[PDB]
């Protein structure tokens, strides 16, 4: 009926579960996680686009001086240079020569690339989870996405899929995050207003539509070269001219546990860490009576070749005596060895042949073959394969690991070799009787 | 009663009539006996008077 | 000064700050907080509004048994009732007699009344603190709305201020909070896909423009009784009606510190908690030397009458023979008494009246009247009036205030108390000299 399982958080590895109601014949089903996409909740702090330095056509006040108006522009700058020399096609521009002064002004504003090309310093926040699951529902694959929080129930094809909680809690992002157009970067930008020239924060705006452009250029003007009708300004390095070329390794590349990032909206996918539970309830439409199954008797497992590996760890033969024709389940009583075969149609009194997979040095275990029991034994061999492109959580172990026969080699050497200390123990009573040899 | 932070009362859609506690506190003297722990009976009653 | 102070977080309390610039003219300035705007995380989660129990037109299969058309509708329900009787104007709607069956179906959808009226299951955490502030500097009541987090510098008529950050980062909001058109409530709305039927929040769509509604409305279609042609069902619990019956304890009226709410976006307004640091900048342009300031001689402050209270709790006349003429400051130095008007004029041999407030009974007072420090003593009075609307934070004192005579009563009673240990030391020296002289 009800069946709650806690599968490990593994992207792209299936899981076989022994679903069974009390009274009927068991069944082995496959579920699989496909993606764990963690969507962070976001808020834009401020943006940064390219600026544009704009000057007027400056004022050539020949024969005198006219003081500028102290306007308020982002990096407004003004200077009336003295004794200037205006020049044009017919020699000097003004007939007045010596008392020619020149007002000059300069300012910086946004540029025209800020419509679609701009970075954005965001404040990142807590993450929202999302998960993808395909179940092979008795030879039928059906797939559904959800929240992996214990809090997202979906039901379709009598499958009350309610997940359990994300057993981890770790998010790969800090609040101080920046984003430009294909990527993100977790660094500490300066905040709005408190920016630094020649960096992130060389120019600061909240939104592109926010016209508060915190600018930092210090574009100090100079006297022109020799009668040259122009305005020279000073040094002002920016941020867009340098750090876009040296942002470097995007957070796609900086990701622990094999996280991956994905924009529109940005999200942390496929670092399946922790262990995800799923409660799934299934009615008696799936379970069938064991009398509809054959009672398999005289089972004997024979492994011609096992090899403790990540892939197909070995092959086995189950001598079985099914009473009739029927479809029934096979499920090993330990999680370590994994029969690749889940629901087998059996026919009679013969030898079926299956495979299995473990990294146990000798797989000695038990399988419920459809409410009947077989005990199995397999001397496994050293793995001759070297590199594998997929991880293997089906053959995975813990640390309480079992050898071929070296535990019996211990049993040789710990049929206690401290029994000579038990000889020392048995002479304790006789040496105490030597103390009692008078009284 | 009024706490030390005061009360804001509110009545219908109308203005929230806040009140801030007046520290009136006049039931003491100086006299021939003490009457200054009478001030400390007014200001901070029942505590900072067990201390003496 | 680059005078960085921390004023208490109280809207509408005139903080009188002191600028004794080094060897310059003293200058008292006023500040007044005007708003405290705290805006948490704008993370809308999902929605909840009214549904529509959609009952399509029933399907009377005249002399035939209709069969179930499985339609993937939210809370879809269908049943073909057998042995029905239809009728109309001219008797029976069917020529058929007893094999009249009638298909009947209904389901739930979203309502169109979610056009503008709905409820927002919504997430929020750390607020973007901003505040309004009016500074009175030399008859200049400048004002500024700045970001109260220590990031947004602001200069006004060259007066520079970085405001904030907030000392107490207390938040009146839960994460799972639901939003009505004027209000917000801390309540665990049921999570998406995993919502409870009939509770306020069964109807669940992701955005208000999203129509994909998970809902559980329990339409068990009843049989229409005998000959009447309609579609009775099990009744639908409408959560959205009594969403508004549980408005009740509004966050406008349940917030501590006298906090105010104003939704869309959600403003935590005027938290009376803690305090706030602030940088204060002005150049030396309003600063002449202390001798270029009018130097006061013949200084004497005297309190003629004072009832120490939340009103103007006292007044004092200062007689003086200043050096010369000038608008020079007045700063009370003892922190309980605060000067009501920050700067005065002086001319020379004059006297003038100041007003202030305190709560000390035997009030001691000390003042920096723009050249000199003058002490005043007083015996003020506790009030007898009862209603005061407005606070008075400056009058407030700590746990230790002076008495009028009982300091002398303390060191009369905690005066000779070591006379007993003096004669005890006499006991100890006589027992030592007799015990050692005899042995
Ligand atoms: C069904 O899924 C299993 C694993 O889940 C896969 O090996 C198989 O190819 C799928 N079959 C179909 C028909 O989709
Ligand atoms: C200036 O501000 C002070 C305190 O903030 C206030 O008492 C006064 O009325 C204001 N004056 C003007 C002209 O706004």
From TrEMBL, chains A, C:
The chain crosses the membrane at residues 417-437. This is Structural polyprotein. It comes from the Viruses. It comes from Chikungunya virus. The lineage of its organism: Viruses, Riboviria, Orthornavirae, Kitrinoviricota, Alsuviricetes. It is found in: Host Golgi apparatus, Host trans-Golgi network; Host cell membrane; Host cytoplasm; Host endoplasmic reticulum. Homodimer. Homomultimer. Interacts with host karyopherin KPNA4; this interaction allows the nuclear import of the viral capsid protein. Interacts with spike glycoprotein E2. Interacts with host IRAK1; the interaction leads to inhibition of IRAK1-dependent signaling. The precursor of protein E3/E2 and E1 form a heterodimer shortly after synthesis. Provides the signal sequence for the translocation of the precursor of protein E3/E2 to the host endoplasmic reticulum. Furin-cleaved E3 remains associated with spike glycoprotein E1 and mediates pH protection of the latter during the transport via the secretory pathway. After virion release from the host cell, the assembly protein E3 is gradually released in the extracellular space. Acts as a viroporin that participates in virus glycoprotein processing and transport to the plasma membrane, cell permeabilization and budding of viral particles. Disrupts the calcium homeostasis of the cell, probably at the endoplasmic reticulum level. This leads to cytoplasmic calcium elevation. Because of its lipophilic properties, the 6K protein is postulated to influence the selection of lipids that interact with the transmembrane domains of the glycoproteins, which, in turn, affects the deformability of the bilayer required for the extreme curvature that occurs as budding proceeds. Disulfide bonds join 49-114, 62-94, 63-96, 259-271, 306-380, 328-370.
């Amino acid at each position: 009926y009800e069946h709650v399982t806690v599968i490990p958080n593994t992207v792209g590895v299936p899981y076989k579960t022994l679903v069974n109601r009390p009274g009927y014949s068991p069944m082995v089903l496959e579920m699989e996680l496909l993606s764990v996409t963690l969507e962070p909740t976001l808020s834009l702090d401020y943006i940064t686009c390219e600026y544009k330095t704009v000057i007027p056509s400056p004022y050539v006040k020949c024969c005198g001086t006219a003081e500028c108006k102290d306007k308020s522009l982002p990096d407004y700058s003004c200077k009336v240079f003295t004794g200037v020399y205006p020049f044009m096609w017919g020699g000097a521009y003004c007939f007045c020569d010596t008392e020619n002064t020149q007002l000059s002004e300069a300012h910086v504003e946004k540029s025209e690339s800020c419509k679609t090309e701009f970075a954005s310093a965001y404040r990142a926040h807590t993450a929202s989870a999302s998960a993808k699951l395909r179940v092979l529902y008795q030879g039928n694959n059906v797939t559904v996405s959800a929240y992996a929080n214990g809090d997202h129930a979906v039901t379709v094809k009598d499958a009350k899929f309610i997940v359990g909680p994300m057993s981890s809690a770790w998010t790969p992002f800090d609040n101080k995050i920046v984003v430009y157009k294909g990527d993100v970067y977790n660094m500490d930008y300066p905040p709005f207003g408190a920016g630094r020239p020649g960096q992130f924060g060389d120019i600061q705006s909240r939104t592109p539509e926010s016209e508060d452009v915190y600018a930092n250029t210090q574009l100090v003007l100079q006297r022109p070269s020799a009668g040259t009708v122009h305005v020279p300004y000073s040094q002002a390095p920016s941020g867009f001219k340098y750090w876009l070329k040296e942002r470097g390794a995007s957070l796609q590349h900086t990701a622990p546990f094999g996280c991956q990032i994905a924009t529109n909206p940005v999200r942390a996918m496929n670092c399946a860490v922790g262990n995800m539970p799923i409660s799934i309830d299934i009615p008696d439409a799936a379970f069938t009576r064991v009398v509809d199954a054959p009672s398999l008797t005289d089972m004997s497992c024979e492994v011609p070749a096992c090899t403790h590996s990540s892939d197909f760890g070995g092959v086995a033969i189950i001598k079985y005596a099914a009473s009739k024709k029927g479809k029934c389940a096979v499920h090993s009583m330990t999680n370590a060895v994994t029969i690749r075969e889940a629901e087998i149609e059996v026919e009679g009194n013969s030898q079926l042949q299956i495979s299995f997979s473990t990294a146990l040095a000798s797989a000695e275990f038990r399988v419920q073959v459809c409410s009947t029991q077989v005990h199995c034994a397999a001397e496994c061999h050293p793995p001759k394969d070297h590199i594998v492109n997929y991880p293997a959580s089906h053959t995975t172990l813990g640390v309480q690991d079992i050898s071929v026969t070296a535990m019996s080699w211990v049993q040789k050497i710990t049929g206690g070799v401290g029994l000579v200390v038990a000889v020392a123990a048995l002479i304790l009573i006789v040496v105490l009787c030597v103390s009692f040899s008078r009284h | 009663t009024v706490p030390t932070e005061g009360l804001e009362v509110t009545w219908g859609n109308n203005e929230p009539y806040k009140y801030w506690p007046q520290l009136s506190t006049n039931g003491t003297a100086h006299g021939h006996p003490h009457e200054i722990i009478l001030y400390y009976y007014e200001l901070y009653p029942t505590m900072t008077v067990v201390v003496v």
